[PDB]
Amino acid sequence: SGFSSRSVITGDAFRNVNEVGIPMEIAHRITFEERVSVHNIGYLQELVDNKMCLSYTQGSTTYSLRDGSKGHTVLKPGQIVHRRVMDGDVVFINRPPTTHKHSLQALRVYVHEDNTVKINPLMCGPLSADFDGDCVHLFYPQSLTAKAEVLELFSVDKQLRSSHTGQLILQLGLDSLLSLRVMMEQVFLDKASAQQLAMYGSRSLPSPAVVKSSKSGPAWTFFQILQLAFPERLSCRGDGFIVGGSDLLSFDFGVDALASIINGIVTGIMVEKGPKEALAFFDSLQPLLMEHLDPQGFSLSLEDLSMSREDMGVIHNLIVREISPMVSRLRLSYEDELQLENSIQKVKEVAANFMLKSYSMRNLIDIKSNSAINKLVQQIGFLGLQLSDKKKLYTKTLVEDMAQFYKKKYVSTSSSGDFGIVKGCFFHGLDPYEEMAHSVAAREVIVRSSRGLAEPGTLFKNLMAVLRDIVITNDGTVRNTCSNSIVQFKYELSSDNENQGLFEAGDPVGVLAATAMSNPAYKAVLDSSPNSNSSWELMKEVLLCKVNFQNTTNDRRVILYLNECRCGKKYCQENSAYTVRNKLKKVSLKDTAVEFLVEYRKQQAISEIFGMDICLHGHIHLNKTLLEGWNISMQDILQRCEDAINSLVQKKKKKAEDFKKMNLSVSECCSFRGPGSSKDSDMPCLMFSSYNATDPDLERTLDVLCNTIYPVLLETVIKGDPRIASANIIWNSPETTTWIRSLHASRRGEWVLDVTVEKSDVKQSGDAWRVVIDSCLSVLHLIDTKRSIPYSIKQVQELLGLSCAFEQAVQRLSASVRKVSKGVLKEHIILVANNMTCSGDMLGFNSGGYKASQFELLWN
């Protein structure tokens, strides 16, 4: 179908949106066939007497060109004619598939020299291109059926609403929105500029707003200038716009929402008069803007990038006021990186507040967006945190010796500030240490966004293997095509009443959902920003689930809520937070020890046993302050050691420790420590003996058997459940910035218990929560069931049932895909979740999960 193209694309604002410019270098080498009919011959003989035609191949198959002076030779109606590429044809534009973002468009051809492709600047969005050297392929519908279905399905006005978001695929771009802003800040126009702009769109011109004054002549407003792009007899109601009879009656102030109030009017025109009036609005508005910018100009300065000096002294008095005393806590505290970023963005916002007090910088940047408001503080303010150990690709050794390398005139002269913090900006320059630190940061972003990235590549095929054969049938039942089973009874909500503009029977909505879910994956991976990297695996937790229980560490967590108020006891909440941890937090013997001393002497007379079976006496000394800190007694240690060493030799283990002594925990043995330690016998507990070899024949070969039970004495637990791996009291801030909850609207500060079980979780799923509930029995009264789910969404399906996991998968995919792409049709989420939850339980979208039209035919 033309099969190839090699050309750069370029832009052109004064030529219509669905028009495309072909080079004559390739336009004279591409053929459109056409059939000679009873109708077309008065046109075709004009096309064939001169040039612009080609071989006149009929059934006699004559490959003679329009070159050998054969003349008119007025053809038989019925023959077929190869010709060149005239204007007004249709083409089909695409690139090689870097992504299957819907680059499929149909465009009208204009033929020129200057061998590039000239598209409108509004097609930089839908075709996903910029103008620094992109190469596109062009395809030509040769058959008439091809032209029929391509023109009927794939034109711009047919595709004017996004089938992946539900908004318009054409919004006002770079210069046009700037033209609207400077036209808003200059509300009045003169006569001459008004009548000059009136030449472009339509609707001649309204009467002037101010028809006279004392000084000037007439004066127009710019809302009357906006009227000229309208179609005829428009009547729509808006949030700020009021249109009655092709006039713009009132328009709200809000310059901040200007890309929406324009976006309101185009949507109203598409509702009231269709898509072919919305395209006329764009094609009358864009040159009307680009000519309004022409006798004013717009530029940058050096005074725009120069922040003032006393304000520079203000911002430098905040690195060493609330950031150096916070990095004084970063010396030992690790996981306050979001507190770190909270204080950082508190600095960055007041930094960005100053450089919007200039005329040119307000108008080139989108004020609201977090993406490009910190970039400008990186070149007027300061950079910030370039190094951490949580940017997880360079190892900890690079961080520790980059911290050490701060001897390079940073310890020889200073200790103020810290490594990883840059107090300088791009505009004033970076001295070589922080230049090196910025280089490792930018290098790490290059490595991260460069490596891998085939995980959405294989995820696209793993979503296409199963979501392919799903259509909307003729009655509305969304069914698998190869099985004819209802996956979903009805599509989009409240579209069964007879109002159209919506989905139809025949739409391959599974293939819509595959692409509409695959695009936020690439938008989250190719940007290595922290909010775009935190939300990349929240899709992988839901979409890449495995049904066969691998017993991972996500399969072990359980969150515990505790809400039993009492109302006014004042820190009964935090006392409730920690005692349930105290019943479950594991402490052992091997941690509180210091040393270990076996000794034949000092208990020769304490050995009173008539046959002298007793010679060796292994002390295991503790430390006092940790035994006295966490309120751990000494006799309960005797209890928990004696019953464990009994109950494990009752287990079929050996007969090596049957005669264990386990005497007493005394807290003061004797003036011991011959080999130099020099302490005064502070908890020297568990002064056992091992007389199993009665009448010990060899001293040295019996001392090793007193070193095969020292480990099993070390590995015992004292206070806490043996099954608990950890327990943590965290997150006094339940707002919407944190992970997925079941309820929180009421409070704003509730404490929780992040509880993790060790690997005693058997192959049966759902046993970690089973153990945690079988653990907290003595303290169930102040823990709060009806809440406190397990964490992984397969285990919730194991506990609460399938239909709870359905809503949880919906909410998790929703809150994940919001944070990268900011708007997505919910019907694709619901379709993906119902395809997971159709055949029994939740089948994932991977290699393991894989292991478990025809609607009409014409007559006449």
């Binding site: 909500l493 019943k583 509930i773 079988d774 009806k786 049932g801 239909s803 809503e807 619901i830 939850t837």
Partner: protein
């Protein structure tokens, strides 16, 4: 808040298990009183042994649906189950005019004596574990009020859209709601959701 923390801990594990099983038979629509399920744990442990209680008359929960549907349980406080225990507790109790029994396993049950548990003619039995029954999954915030449909409405569902039995969105016969209400292959359940995305959505499932 405030905290006391003494317990004969084993009796707590039967208080919660018994109260959950009586709530389950209450929601299966059987004749069970208010006070037998709404007792406290203190007056539980007084009348029923503070620490010890095995093979007690607590287990004798046995009730009628409306006239003649009989379900009783047999708690096993043991640490090992064989065929002799279950035969000795069933071959005497089936002569008390029952048609369905329940099993409360505590340790584990093995497949080595499984055919002798499903040999029982006209007397279907259900099993559990004690450690699953310490909560109410129906009382949880994230649980959904199911509404089971009758046979006539099932046929009207199959004939409305001219659809076969085996074409529906399925649900497994081991789901925590399927095993709870005592449901059967073929029976159609209906769920009404609530959520910021899925609010007015409804969905039908039959058991496979």
């Amino acid at each position: 808040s405030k905290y006391v923390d003494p317990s004969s801990e084993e009796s707590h594990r039967y208080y919660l298990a018994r109260r959950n099983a009586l709530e389950m038979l209450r929601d299966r629509g059987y004749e069970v009183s208010l006070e037998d399920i709404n007792l406290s744990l203190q007056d539980f442990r007084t009348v029923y042994g503070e620490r010890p209680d095995v093979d007690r008359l607590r287990i004798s929960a046995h009730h009628r649906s409306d006239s003649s549907n009989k379900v009783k349980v047999v708690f096993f406080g043991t640490g090992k189950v064989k065929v002799n225990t279950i035969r000795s507790v069933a071959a005497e109790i089936l002569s008390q005019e029952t048609i369905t029994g329940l099993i409360l396993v505590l340790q584990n049950q093995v497949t080595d004596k499984a055919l002798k548990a499903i040999e029982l003619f006209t007397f279907k039995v259900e099993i559990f574990q004690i450690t699953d029954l310490l909560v109410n999954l129906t009382k949880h915030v994230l649980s959904l009020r199911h509404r089971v449909l009758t046979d006539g409405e099932k046929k009207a569902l199959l004939k409305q859209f001219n659809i076969e039995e085996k074409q529906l969105p399925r649900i497994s016969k081991k789901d925590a709601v399927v095993r709870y209400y005592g449901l059967e292959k073929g029976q159609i359940v209906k769920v009404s959701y609530r959520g910021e995305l899925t609010e007015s959505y409804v969905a039908y499932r039959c058991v496979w």
